[model samples]
Structures are given as structure tokens and as C-alpha cells.
Target: SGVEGAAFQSRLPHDRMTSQEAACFPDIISGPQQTQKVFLFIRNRTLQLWLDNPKIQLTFEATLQQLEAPYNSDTVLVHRVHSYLERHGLINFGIYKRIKPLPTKKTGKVIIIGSGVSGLAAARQLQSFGMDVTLLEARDRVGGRVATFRKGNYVADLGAMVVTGLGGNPMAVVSKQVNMELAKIKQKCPLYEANGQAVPKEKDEMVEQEFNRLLEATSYLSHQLDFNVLNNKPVSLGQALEVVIQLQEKHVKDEQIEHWKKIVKTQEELKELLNKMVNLKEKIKELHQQYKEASEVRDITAEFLVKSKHRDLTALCKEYDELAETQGKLEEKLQELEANPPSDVYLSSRDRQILDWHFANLEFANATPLSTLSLKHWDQDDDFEFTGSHLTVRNGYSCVPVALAEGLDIKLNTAVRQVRYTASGCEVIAVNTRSTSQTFIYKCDAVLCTLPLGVLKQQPPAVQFVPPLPEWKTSAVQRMGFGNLNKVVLCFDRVFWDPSVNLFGHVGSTTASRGELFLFWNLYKAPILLALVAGEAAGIMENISDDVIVGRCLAILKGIFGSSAVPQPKETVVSRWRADPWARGSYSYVAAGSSGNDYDLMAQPITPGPPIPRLFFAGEHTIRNYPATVHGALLSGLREAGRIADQFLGA
Candidate 1:
């Protein structure tokens, strides 16, 4: 029988630096609520484990090991490891050398404030700690921001559709438990012109590179300024871009920018083509070896070490030269662009619009405007992000919460009015808006509040903390932004655009108009086109009626695809997240004035001593690593649960 214990394989060669590389340990048991098995097979060279999926060092310790370590754990589901790693801005579990199960035993009962994903997760984890949990939800449904609007077979994930990262994202563990289907959105997005015509491959692709280079230039400025940035010198990314584009424009001619761009695209293609040929040649060798029942390397006998025959090395070497030649030439242009100043860069009117379109997509990520995003702090959490392409649930995200909400005590439509915390225990006063005769009370040993920042910003205080939340807690609520990112989903009579393409982009006429009907997602189930309205436009559209919003989107579509090709939507669904009383907006983001420090500060318990702190917090707003993401919310909930467990079981 294989022992469920750690075993190491130390490599030879004292000076080779390859010792203790291979190891064997039980990997995680994939599922929801079942984290019984864990493994740590750390190989320094590959940094991989036989756990099937690639594992990084740590997301939080990977990021926050330096200090912002609001979360601490040794026996957290080895699969449940790695969150905001602020130190190196990375995520994974390479440091927690000692892994053991959290010895939890009846940590005590608790009450959760909301029924959102965070609250749901917090409840689930608390129960796992042998504590009874009761979630108080204002809405009739369980999933808060993870709302999935399903009508018959036509499913529209109105709120959240994508899991930002697949590798090391805890959702993978949770999804497997429920046997949920996750679909990776193919990178087959085709950009359409304002005329509804697909953009020219050359034109669309060239600008894409220019925009990427502009961002690279922006990153250089950000990093340089971070090292020598004299108190927010540029203030925002837009400001830093002002200098780089001008210097490049001053020296490079229109002809030069055009020729150099083609060179770069060709360079990328040639390298890709070479990879396919080389990879196949090496792979075919493996097939030949496998036929003889063996593996590569070590050449056990000198005779067997004879060189293997393959592709012509001469032609292979030449193909590589042509690609490198272009790469070198492109770098020359880059050097010239960076080595000069006082160059006035010019973005053609169309280029500006395309750039604006990219900004709108960025706004969806932050759910805040360019002006509001901090050039210094925005994307700080992205420094150590998860690997794998973005993925969305093919079935729906609602099921995860539904599964977590099972067996847990949940009072739906019961909105919390006041939360009172005393030395003895915590209690809540709430009223059921739909089906309550009078006000009610819920008492527990601890209170885990997962209120949205938008709701927290309410004038009357949505949930009154009887003792009043500390200045720092309330300050974070005020400082962090809660922006809107609404969706106008429409069902047409037939598909009017490319069937294979999943995303469609509309270049804005001006920078300010960027967020209006900016992008459209083709939900493969039907002829449904979901229009994403983000930034200021989303906030403004919330004040309008659904029909008006639907009409405007249709008008924009007709303008793009021509009236004959576009038809009035047979049905429509418009989201007004800003106007929703429970959720004043879509998600949370760090504003220019506020830093990620606030994310950790808010995670602080009402009483920060050691013995079971009272009012705890969980949600996307409470995490710095993955704010405005489904995983962020999920991870934060698990985080609070771990914190509570540690209080009684010992960290």
C-alpha cells in the first residue's frame, strides 16, 4: 500500500545543485467540500508536482509573505493554498514546507451577513470547521454577483461569465467537486469596424501590435517610475504613455512605423512556424522510442547513443536566421523609439478609436475608468497571477454557490438591518422584505459580514454595526470604488456576424465614448449577442429603462452590420446593477487615492486580538490579489473561514 506521506528523491552530484528535486506525496482529492488528501512533490528545476496541474509557490505568501499577510495557514487544503502573494506578486505553495491538516473540532457556530459567493463559501468552510452557519440574504436567490439568468435552455450569465485564471485557481477544485463543466473561450475574437464589416487582417493586426507596444512602453514607465517615481509623478497610465509615444513619433516616419510593424508580425509568425516543425520532429522520436518500450536520455549503451536522423539541419538553421533577422531589425526600431525625446507621436483617428476600445475592455477588468485607476496600484495583484487561459462555466457559476449553500442554514430575503457585537457573542436584526410579519434576530458566536462596497456606501448605512465599524474599515469602504459593468443581452432572429467568433469589438468614435456598447459576446447557444456596457456609460445607462437601452444597442448594431443584416431583437435582458438595491454596482476596484493596503485592512476583524474576534469580513472587496473576479470572491470567503478556524484551532 502507498503511504500517504512525503518521500524525497535526492539527485547525485554534490556541486550539480540538483539534490532533493523529485518527491512523492498524495495529491489533492478533487471535489467540492472534500479536501482530505494533499501532496507536496516540489522539484526545484521544473517547480512542478505530480498533482496533474502545475503548482506555483504561493498566491498570497507568493505575494504577501513580505508583510501584507492577512491570511496565514499551514494545513489549508494543499489544494486550497496560494492567494495574494504580494512579496513576489505570485500565487502557489512552494514555501509551506510543513503541511498538515487543520485539527479542527467544533470551532463554534457563526452567522454570515450575505448569501453571495463569499458568504456561501464562508458558511461552507465554517461548517467544515464543525460550526453551524446561517447566512442572511436580502435576495430570494443564493448567488449574489454570480447570478446566472437561465430562461429555459437560453442561458445568460448576466453578472460573471469568466473565471480569470484556470491554473491554480481554487474554482477548478470546487468545479470538479460538483462535476461542473467549464468551457475555455476560444481566442477567435474578430474585430469589426464601425461599418459592421470585419477589420482588415493586416490593419487589425498591425494596430494590435502598436497598442501592445504602447502598453509595454507604459509598463516600462510604470516600473521606472516605481523605482524613481517622485510621489506619483505621472498620476495615471495615460499620462506615462504621453511621453513614450511622442518620443517614438518624433524620430520614426509613417513609412518606418508601417514597415517595422510588418517586420515584427512576420517575426512572430516565423518563430511560431519553426516551433511546430521542431516540436513534431522531437515528438516523433519519442514515438519511435515508445514502440521499443523505453524513455528518453541516459543512452544506457554507447551504441544506442548514435545520433538520431531527422530534418535537414541546414534548412532548419536558415529558417531560424530569417526570423531572427526580422526580430533584430524590429529591436533596432524599438531602441530608436526609446532613445529619443520631443517626438510628437500620431495615432490616426481610427487608431485612437481602436485604442479607446481597448481601454473600454480594461475598464471591465477594473470596473473603473482610466482616470480613476491608479497608475501605481492598479494591477499590483496581477504581478503573481494564476496560469492558464481564462475559462467560463459552460453550465453556470450559480451551481457552485448552490452546492455550497446546501445543508447550510440560509434565510433568503431576510435583509440585515443592524449588527450588534458584544464581548459574549454577535447578533443581527433583520426583516424579510418578501415574507416577514415583523423584524427578527439572529445570534451567533461570530458575525462574518460580506456586504458589497456599493451597498456599504449607502447613505443610511445598509447594515448598521451597533458599535460602529472602526474608522479604517469605514474608510476603505469609502476609498475603494464600486463601479458598474452592465450587460444588454439580445436575441436576434439569426446570427448576423461570424459564427465562430466569440467576441466582437466596436471602436469608439472618441476616447470619452469608449465604454458605450463597446464589446459584444456571442453566446454560442443561440443567436444571442450580449453587449457589454462598462465604465461611466454603464452608470449612466442604469438610469434609463430596459427598452431604451435595448433600442440603443440595436441601433448601434444596425449601424455596424447595416439595417438589412441586423434585426430587432426578439427578446432582451438588460442589467441595472447600479440601481439594484442589494448590489449598487457590479464589482470593486482600487481607486487612484486608495491602495491595496485597504483590501487587507478591511479583512481585519472587529477585535484583532487572538481569542475569536467578532465581526469578520469576506468578499472580492476584501482581497487585493483578485478583486472584481469570481475567484477573488471565492478565495476571500475561504480566507475568512480559515481565519475563523485558526482563531480557535490555532494558526
Candidate 2:
């Protein structure tokens, strides 16, 4: 019969012949039209055949050969058949089996090292693509640093507690999945002087308002400068802020000199106005330091200090009010002098407080001190248009990874020692944590390594590669920062402080000490307070005993409460993430002199001499925009899984 005559041919007897053999038989015995018919039959039978006998092999050679004669032949039919095979998971890039036109078995098996968010995600994605995947975790638990501890009815988070950002974040997605209700913190903190006296409500409000103004100014200043111009040269953000302010001053004076002349009318009048502005500027700077110091000293409030030094309390208060008015006038006058007034040009007492708050906020967000963070990339994480309030996981942050980990093969308490990979497959050697003498070996086609960057930086190393990683990869790990951020959770029997407030802080004697016992988050009305200390303070807190830390926290609490009625906590839970062996630090940050491109380098897989990638990386540190977040960790995991699937499974 002619090739067109065989279009509606009946199914061939293919019980013994494999799918691949059946496809090729028509191509070899008959014309291209008959081959197209056989290819269509192979596509229709793949899923059923694999369900019956999963060892059958699937092929696309006969379909591809029809592409040579597109107009005269069955190119569209061939492509349709090829697409059908892919949809049914009957196609992979390289591997094949005994039968044709059906998938032999899973094309490959993957071992994911670390059962954290990244590892679990990779395993789930790979398994979804029809690959057998096993996830190995060193700890007995599934979640890596997303740890949640419970005592009777109280739930406390020692690791990741809050899901940052709002829409589209992986954590947010998972939060919705688990039906977690997160409350936004709204109450303004009541400031307290070191003398155990609350700051006057009006004065506190003024300070907070001014501080917020300064933040906007400094943020604007940061936008005008090019941090990349300095390249690897490192400068503290505080120093960089000062430099940008001075540069703006020069630009304003040069461009708006005529405007200043018109305002003053003469050189001497202008000179006098400039002198007055300078004097007032100096006075504000002095007052800010004085205020900071007096607040931290016992028995001294702003009002008390003004009253004690002068016998005429009314005159002192009047002079203080007048001084503020004059300073405001000078600031306005100076603004007119500049072509474009700099936001941070005039630093008032409130402005300084705002600056200090910014530093504290940075330390809190990045888990690093201002000195260690790069000025260039500080605001890059705010790239998303997420205006929603920060959501603390009501149920717990661990619920995210726990949900992602469902249905995956997870091996708990199995510490990976070494990974050896070649062109064909990989070998993972690990020992059980309980029985270190007993070693287990896992063989797979690929290995997804989701180990933390901190663990990789340790001197002796916890997980080793058979042949050491390249110098570039090692350098990238070292160049990125891993810093300490620890917390002390205190559970009280009753709430003693204001029930309306959600946060509070203590002003310290010096800049370095300012962040000590600096931040506290009240968990709604749960009778709990979470004390956060980051960067240098965290490291110092780490060295101190837990009892001492708890005592210190209680002392600060007593000072803030202004009474001795504060009771000792019924229970205290301290997190020492920095000292953790598996996670040497809490998270990663782009250190001064380093850029985010380094994170991109760290995320890349090491192919070695293999044709296909054997080793892959995923973690918070690996993602650029979202590093140091649970969302980043989850996204990185999915990214690596997709990469492997695209290369190996042709998905």
C-alpha cells in the first residue's frame, strides 16, 4: 500500500517489542508516512505502557526524521507526538531503557543534601518531574534554622519568626496555604530615660517626628551618590552619609549663590546670616549629644536637667523653647541658601535619634552592624513594591518548611561527610549522628547541595567534596558575610507594661552600647517579650551566660517600667544561632567591599568534568534580592530544581 493508505492502520502486535523498537520498525520497513503513524501510536501508548511496565524506553528518532521533508511529509503530526510524550513524562535528555515509546523508569535519582527549605523544595520539584529524590538533614528535625519551640500552650521561635514582605513572597504564599493570621504591629513605643522616668509624651512625639524626617533626608542623600564608583574601597555607612551630605552642600552653594545674595542683599549681611546658621547648627549638635548622654544617666530627664542647672526653672524652659525656634529659623534660612537643600544638612537632637534608629533598624534587618554593611546595596532589598506590614507567623515560621517538606523522602540525623560525582552519577557518604561509626552511601545522578554559607566557611569544614571546590567558589563564600543575630525570649506570668505598645528601646551611654538590649517585640498579649540583639552586641551576648543575659534583660525591663514591680520570667529561651556548628551564623549579608554578584557566583552549580551538572547550590545566601530571608531560601530551592529538571528531564 501507498504511504497515505497506511494513515488509519490498526495497532501492531507490540507485546514483546518495546516502544522504541516499535517506532523504529515502521521507519526501517516502510515510508515516512507509515513512520508518522507508528510515532502517533507510540505517543498514545506511552503512559499506559509505563503504568503497566515502567521499564519501557521511549524514543523520538522517527518523529525527528520527518522534519527533513516538512512540506511533503508529516512534520506537524511528528511534533504533536513528541509533545505528547513530554507531557506524559516519557522523555528525558540522555537516559533510555529496554522498551521504546515509553519511559523506562525514572531517568535519574537525586540526593539533596540538607533538608532545610531549599533542600526540601529541590526534592519536591525533582520528584514532581518524575525523578526519585532523597533529602538528608544533619539535624533530627526537618526545618533548618526555621525553628519553633513549644511549651504547653506557648509557642516561641528561636530562628525565623517573621515572614517579611507581603504578596508573592514564598513565605507569604506558604503562609496563605497554612491559613496563618499575622497581626501588624501598630503602637508607638514609649521612650524612657535612664533615670527610670518616661520621656514627656509631647517631647517624645517631637523627637519621633523629627527622627522620621531625618530618615527621609538621609535616604534621599543616599540616592544621589554612586557607591559603585569606589569599587572595593570600604567605608562605614555613617561615614558615607557624612560624605554625601558635604558633597550636597558644595553643590547647593555653587548653584544657588545668587539666591543667597538676593536673600541677604549684601556680603556682610550674608556673612552674618551664615555665622548665625553655623552657631545654631553647632548648638543643635551639642544638644543632641547632651540629650543622648542625659537620658542614659540616672536621675536625669530632659526637663529635670534644664531645671536642676538653673534656679529659675521658668527662664530655663523659656530659653530652651526660644533656642528651638531660633534653630528652626536658621535651618530655614540655610535651606534657601542652597540650590537644592540637603536632607541631612542640619542634625537636630531628634534627627540624631532618627539616625541612631536607622542604624539599629539596619542591624536588625541584616543581622550586621552599620560598620560591616555596604552603603551601596543597603536599600536593594526594598526593590519589591510590598507596602504591607511585616507579618510575624502566628502559627510559627516552621510551618512553611514543614509544608514544603511533605511527601518528600527525608532522612533525619544523617550528617553528610563527602560528595563524589562523575559524568554518570554521584556518591554521597554520610554517617548517622547517633552512630557516627556506621557510614551510609547514597548513589544518585545529581546532588543538590543546600548547605549554609557559614557552614562552608568553617575551618575544618563539615561537608567536604571529594576534590576540593574551585578557588573562585571558596573565595565567594569567604567574601560574603555571615554575622550573629541572637534573641532572648522571656515568658512572664502577667503583663506589667502598657498593653497598647508593641516595641520599646533604651538609649545607651555610647554609640556602640546603644544597640544593647536595644529592641523588644511584644507578642500581642501572649505574656511574652522577645529581646533582640544583633551584630557586635549579639556576639558579646553570645559569650555571656544565659542567666546573665536574662538578668540584664530583666534589669532593662525594670528601668523601662520605672518601678521595682517587675517579676522574673517564668521561663526564658535563648537562641545561639552563631555558635551553632551546622550554621555558624544566623544569615548572610553583603559586607563592605563586596557586591551582590558574589551571591550569584555562590549559587552556580559546579559541573567539574561532567557533561551534565552534578553539584547544585540553594539557600538564602544564594539568592541576590531576597537573601537573609525564608522567602529567599524557598525561591533558591525552586530555582535549582528547575535548572536540574530542564537539563536532565527536559521538562
Candidate 3:
């Protein structure tokens, strides 16, 4: 059974479980191992991710040798290997079910709250280990924020899109399993004023380049300096950017000052030269006069010397006259020039407008404004983010979740009311939406709550905790940020916009106005324009009517494309994640006073273990490495499942 079934293994300590590495690691090690070349390349990412970081994957032909220690199919083997890695301080994300393993039939019921991607992923993972798992979704449908609106040929993702980073993203592995196709979103965003004037490439590229430079400088400041060193108060993301931007502005101001300093030096040098020349000319004239006045009545012997002195005096007087003329001309020219001074003062108004537009786009990307995002901790996950271009689902984002939720006992319209857990076991109280009178209480060994951060942060408390979660857990949830990043989809009757570009941006007249309908997306050349309303603007549009929202969007479009050219949209779709009880806000972020550690605190399980941990938590807010991403949420679910398997079945 040695190296059977075209299997490849790379336990090289230096090698990372990267997408590019996993896809082609076998290629480099393709020489003869058993007098045979192995390049059958199944393209099964589900099998690959599981085998990469944490375990010795069993080969297909080796599967028949069930009693063999290395070829065992027991789920407990997964826990044994996972524990070994954990003891040695090794982190592995690929601890899931493999195709070869015969699942161990365990006798434990698990209740997973919320049917988001995280909840679904947890259920599937636990099910693979033979743990009876059920998901309770409050809403009538699944896919919490990863919703896709479908009506005839028009379809739009009202909540989330973009698989984010394709490289090493778990969703990419899942996508390959389901055979889902994704379209890459190009980074060719063009900016335009509200008045329909397109921003020239020169100005656009200049501001874009500086904007990125400022962002990089902010990241540098985040890593390099302590905020307390600069000022006594806590700083924000906006303040960090401003600090770096001011640094550049000061540099430019100094350069201009240097130009003026050069002008001053030249003036001083010329004026001093003229003054010295004037003094010499005056003294020369006076000396020549003295020579003429002091002339003695010459004796016959000294007549030749007197005649020579007179000739020299006359020549000196002529030189003085020439010098005085030159000094006068120089003074005249200096005075004329001083009347209308020249300076180095060139200002560009377009830079600020372009910058504002760029900031608004950032607001959308983070689901919050720069002012609220923590200066030191915002976007720290990008350091470990999956590399490669961001991609959107081919048809809609619903397909990925649909694929993930293919086989599972998902109880829809069953909203969880309360979770009561202690040392012995756990019990969950759930309400059937259709049958309100009938409250179903399910008892289980463990409960994995995958509620969104916003839902957990509800003021009145949407799903109550039996003992009202500890202050540490509650505070961690409170410290994390959640903001509204809404979308306004306008189904125009015609393609009034320039369909050539995938993205277009609008610059508002004011800073606060910038986030209103600032960015637009057109995927697959659809007639529908998905306008993004992000940052402060998202909150403002929360309670507004859909018609009013549509009208406001039309007004902005009219201003950009002309009122005559723009017509009323036949259909309009607006997303209000803020008002949704289950969501409350868009996604989680590192708040103003919080660091990335808050995410780790959120993931920490509740209730100490005897047989196993009574309560577990999973969500996008749980993982700091990839927060606010579908992959992050998926990994969170898998992470919790791994911990459970390690405890409940590790022995």
C-alpha cells in the first residue's frame, strides 16, 4: 500500500498550504517514486485542503486496509493528529472530513443556531464526524447576508458578493466541489463628478496613486509607531491618513519655501554687488576731483609728472561715470521686478474631489467610515488574506451557499429562543414561525451558536442567553464594530451608463455627501446598475422608503448622465441590512477603541469541559484572520467543529 492511488504528500516544514503550492506541489515532485510517475491530478480541492496542513491522507488503494494504523478510517484519528499539532503550537485550518474515512457513528445531538454560511459549514463538518447536528434559522429562508434576489432574468445580490481572495480561500475549495464558476472583477474603476464630467486619466491616476501611497503610509504608521508617542488621545483611521497626508503636504510647502528662499538669496547677492559698485564709483569721482583741486603751480622740472596725474584722474572719472550708469540700470530693473513679485504657488482642486471619492469607496469596502475604524487594528486581516483577484459568483452569490447546504437537516423558520447549558448537557428552546403556539425544546450534548455580531449586540436581545452571557463575552461583542453597507439596484430600461467599464464612481460636492451613491457595479453587462450606499450614508437611508431611495438615486444619475438622457427605472431594489432584525448591520470590523484581539475573544467557547465544552460560538466576527468574509465565516464554523471533535471524540 506504499504510495498507492496516485497520492502525493509534502510534509516539508518550509512549505505553506497555499493554493498555488497545493495546485502544483505534485508537479515538482513528479519524478519516479515506485518506478512510476503519479500525475492523475483529480482536481478535488475538498480532498486537497484536508490533506495539506494537518494529516497523512490515506490513498484510494490503501482504503481497503482498514485495520492498518496508517490506513484507518476512524474519525478519532483526525482528532489524534489535530491534538498532536495543537500541542506543538501548529495551526491547521484543513481539519475536515476526507473522502476515504469511514465516519464514526457518534451518539450526540448538536444544536446550531442561525443558518448562515458559518452555521451550515459547522453542521456539515460535525455531521461528517457522525454528530447529529440541526440548524435553526429564524428567517423563512437560509443564507443570512449572502442573499440573492431572483425575479425573471433580473438578478442581484442584495447583501454580499465577491468571494474576496481566491487563493487559499475555503470557499474556493467548496466552489470546486460544487463546480461553481466565478467571474473576476477587474481593478479599472473610473471616477466622475456629479455633474457628469469624467475625471481625466492624468488627474485620476495622480490622485489614485497618492491615495494608495497615503494608505500604505497609514499602514506603516500602524506597525511602526505608538499612538501615545504622537498625541495623548486615541487616534482613528481617518486621523492616521491625515497625519501621513499632512506629512506630504508639509514636504511640498517646504519645497515651495525653498524656491522663495532661492529668490531671496539672488536678490540679496545682486543688491549687495550694486551697493559696493556705487560706493567705488562715488569714491573714484571724489578722488579724481581732489587730484584736480590740489594741483600745485608746477615747476619746469615737475611739469611732466603733473600732466601724467591729470590724464590718470580724467580716465578714473570716465570709469566712475560708466559704473554709476550700470548701478542705476540695475536699481531700476530691481524696483520694476519688485512691483510684481513671482512665487511658487500652484494648487489643484481636482485632487481633493478625487480623494473624497476614493474615501467613499473605502467606506463601502470596510462597511464603515474611516473615522470609526481603529487606527492601529483596522484591516489587520489583510496580512493573512488569500492572494489573487477578487471574484463574484457567475450567476448570483446564492449558488455557493446553496452548494454548501446541499445535504443537512436544516430546519427553516425555526428561530431559537434561548440556550440553556450546564455541566451535564445542553437544551435549546426554538419557536416554529408557522406554529407559534408549539415551542420545541431540543436537548443536545453541545450547541454551536453562529449568530451575527449585530444580532448578538441587539439592545432588547433577539435570542436570550439563559444566564445572560458573562461580561467578558458581552463586552467583546460590544467592542467589535458593525455598520450598514447597503446597495441600491436600479433596473434601468436602457444602458444609459458607459457599459465598457465594470466600475464607475461619483464624487459628491461635500465630504458627508461622498458616501451617497458613490460607487456602481455592473457584472455580466446586465442593464441593472448596482449602486453602493456605504459609510454614513448607509445609516441615513435605513428608514427611508424604497421609492424615495430610488428617486434620490435617479437624481444623482440625472446629474451624472443628464436629466434628458436618464429615464425613470422600470424596477428598483434597495437593501436595508440595518433594519433587518437578524442582521441589524452589514458586517463586523475592528471598532475605534478595539483591536483585532476582540475577534479572538468572541470565538472563545463558553462553559468549561468535562466530557466536552457545553457551548461554542462561530461567526465572521470570531476570526481575526479573515473577518467580514464568507471564507472567514466558513472557517470559523470549521474551527469550532474541529475543537468539538478534538474534545468529544479525541479520546
Give the best candidate by TM-score.
3
lDDT of 1 by residue, 312-375 (tens): 3434555556666766766675566445433234677777677677778888877877677666
Model 3, 1-651: lDDT tens digits are 122211222221122233433333443345444311112222222234333423333333332243334324544434333343322112222233354553566557889999888888777767766688888898887888999877777778898888876655666556655566788887888777877788888989878888898888887777776661235655788888877777777777887777666667658867787787778777767776656655744576477666776777678777667767766766676666556554333225556777878898888888998888888878777767666788877578777677667667888888898898888888899999899997999898889999999999998887888767889999998989997899998876678877766788888777776798888888743578888988888998777899998888888788778889888887888898988888999999887788889999999989843444688999998988889988888878887887777667663
Better of 1 and 3 by lDDT: 3
Q: Report the CA-based lDDT of candidate 3 relative to the real structure.
A: 0.73
Q: Each model's TM-score?
A: 0.70, 0.67, 0.78
| Runs of candidate 1 exceeding 4 Å displacement | 1-107, 226-234, 242-345, 435-437, 608-612, 649-651
Best by lDDT, which number?
3
| Model 3, residue 225: C-alpha shift (Å) | 2.7
What does candidate 2's lDDT look like per residue over 1-651, in tens digits? Answer: 222211111112332334543453444335566554455454444323332322224334533543344322555555555554443333321122323432336768889989888787667657656788899899989889888777766677888887655643444435545556676665587655544566677766665664565445556545675544355566546566556546656765664665655555544554665676567566656665665565565444666885544434344455556766665675666555554533433444543553465466567778888677766665556665244567676656677677767667899989999999887779999999998998999999888998888899988888888768888899999888887788898988888877777777655444565566777877633688888886578877788888999998888888877446689989899988878887888999888767788889989998867377889999989988778887778778777877787778773
Cα lDDT for residue 260, model 2? Answer: 55
Candidate 2: Cα lDDT at 242: 56
Predictions in order: lDDT: 0.68, 0.68, 0.73
Model 1 TM-score is 0.70
Question: How many residue pairs clash per model?
Answer: 27, 6, 0
